[PDB]
Amino acid sequence: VKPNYALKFTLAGHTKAVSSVKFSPNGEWLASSSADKLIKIWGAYDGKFEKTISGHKLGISDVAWSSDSNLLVSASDDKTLKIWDVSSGKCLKTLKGHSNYVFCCNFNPQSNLIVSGSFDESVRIWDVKTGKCLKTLPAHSDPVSAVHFNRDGSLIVSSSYDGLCRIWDTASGQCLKTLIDDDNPPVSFVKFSPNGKYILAATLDNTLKLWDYSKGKCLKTYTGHKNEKYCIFANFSVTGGKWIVSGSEDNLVYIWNLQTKEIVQKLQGHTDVVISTACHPTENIIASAALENDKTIKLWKSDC
Numbered sequence: 001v002k003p004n005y006a007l008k009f010t011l012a013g014h015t016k017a018v019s020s021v022k023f024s025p026n027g028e029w030l031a032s033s034s035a036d037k038l039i040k041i042w043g044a045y046d047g048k049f050e051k052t053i054s055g056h057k058l059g060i061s062d063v064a065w066s067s068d069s070n071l072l073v074s075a076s077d078d079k080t081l082k083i084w085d086v087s088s089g090k091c092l093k094t095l096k097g098h099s100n101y102v103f104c105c106n107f108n109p110q111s112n113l114i115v116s117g118s119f120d121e122s123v124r125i126w127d128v129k130t131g132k133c134l135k136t137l138p139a140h141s142d143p144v145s146a147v148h149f150n151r152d153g154s155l156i157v158s159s160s161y162d163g164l165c166r167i168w169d170t171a172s173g174q175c176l177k178t179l180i181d182d183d184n185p186p187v188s189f190v191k192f193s194p195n196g197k198y199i200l201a202a203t204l205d206n207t208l209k210l211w212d213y214s215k216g217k218c219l220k221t222y223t224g225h226k227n228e229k230y231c232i233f234a235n236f237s238v239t240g241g242k243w244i245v246s247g248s249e250d251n252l253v254y255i256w257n258l259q260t261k262e263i264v265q266k267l268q269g270h271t272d273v274v275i276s277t278a279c280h281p282t283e284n285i286i287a288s289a290a291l292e293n294d295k296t297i298k299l300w301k302s303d304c
C-alpha cells in the first residue's frame, strides 16, 4: 500500500517564509505562522482564508492549538509567547520569561499548560489560565528545537542542537531519560508517537529515527531526504496507512512507510525548503509550508 496524495489547494497570503502549520484538533482549520509576524487561519477542507492574527513584534517560529480548538499559542523571536482567542483574534496572555528567541511550543492534552523551548537553552512550563511560568528547566546546552507532551501530559520530550533528546516528568521537572545514539548530530525536531510509546527525532544529518525511549533503542531509521540546516517538522500519519511525513531541504514532502522504512511518496510543487508538514486528525490530508522563495502552504489529499 502506497498513498496517492495530490495537490488540492495552494494558500498564498504570507509575505515572508512560513514557519509552521498545524491543523486544529476539531479538523476544521489550519493555522500558519510566519517570519512576517502573523498567524493566519484557513479552512482545512477548502483552503479558504479565514483571518489574520497579529501582535508579535518579530517573526514567529511556531504555533499550536489547544485541545478544544479555541486557543492558539505562538512562539516568537520577540522572546515571548502569546495565547490567542481564535474566534476574536485577541491576545489573551503574553508569556514573558525567556531571554532569547522562543522557538517551539505546545499545549498539553488537558490544555491547562503550555511547554516552550528557546534559544536561551531552557524549556519553560506555563499555566494557561494565569500566564505564570511554573517551571524553568535548565534543559540543554544549546538552542531547544522542539518540545512536546505525551498523550496524558505526564511527560515532556525536548530536543536540542546539543545533540540530545531529554524526557522530563511534567509534575516534578526531573529529567527521567537522556537519549543519544553513538554519534551526536544536532537534534532538530522531536515528538511523541500518538500512543506515547515512541519518540520520532530528526537530526541535522539527513535522518529521522523512531525510538523506544524507555529501552533507549532505535527501532527505525528514515532517510533519502535532505536536512542539515533547518529545524523541519515531522509527523506520524495514522488516518490511512501508517506513515512518517516530513519536509526536506530539496523542496519535497517525504512520506515513508513507518514499519518498512521505505519511501512511499514524494510530493513536488514547493519552490523552497519545506519547513513544516502537518497531518489532519481525521482525513488523509497533509499541509506543507515553505521558506522565502515560496511563502505558500499547500493542501494535499490521499485515498489512504
Ligand SMILES: CC[C@@H]1NC(=O)[C@H](CCCNC(=N)NC)NC(=O)[C@](C)(NC(=O)C(C)C)CCNC(=O)[C@@H](c2ccccc2)NC1=O
Binding pocket: 017, 018, 019, 020, 034, 035, 058, 059, 060, 061, 062, 077, 101, 103, 104, 105, 145, 146, 147, 189, 229, 230, 231, 232, 233, 275, 291
Ligand atoms: C521561517 C524562516 C526560517 N526560520 C526557521 O528555520 C526557524 C523556525 C523553524 C520552524 N519552527 C520549528 N521547527 N519549531 C519547532 N526560526 C529561526 O531560524 C529563527 C529562530 N527565527 C525566525 O526565523 C523567525 C524570523 C521566524 C532565527 C532567525 N532565522 C534564521 O536565521 C533563518 C535561518 C537561516 C539559515 C539557517 C537556519 C535558519 N531561519 C529561517 O529562514
